[PDB]
């Protein structure tokens, strides 16, 4: 009897395993900008600067 029980357990734990295909998708979009403008001044004879 115990044999016929454990064969019915083994029968149901022996099943095939499905297999998943995991496909990640990573999207990284960067963008940048900048505008740096300015006027400087100087006189080195008598040192005076902007």
């Amino acid at each position: 009897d115990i044999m016929n029980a454990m064969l019915e357990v083994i029968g149901q734990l022996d099943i095939r395993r499905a297999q998943v295909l995991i496909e990640a998708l990573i999207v990284e979009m960067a963008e940048g900008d900048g505008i740096n403008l300015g006027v400087q001044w100087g006189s080195l004879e008598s040192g005076s600067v902007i």
Binding site: N4, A5, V9, Q12, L13
Partner: protein, 48 residues
Amino acid sequence: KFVADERTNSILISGDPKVRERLKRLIKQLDVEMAAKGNNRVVYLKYA
């Protein structure tokens, strides 16, 4: 009176051919084997 062997798993009898009639009746009476009860069960968890 009564005997059996579980080498053979067999009722032996000591007594009447009336004991032979009724105790072939009880030879037959409890010979039956209970149907499987699914005493144990393997359950497939869906989530947990």
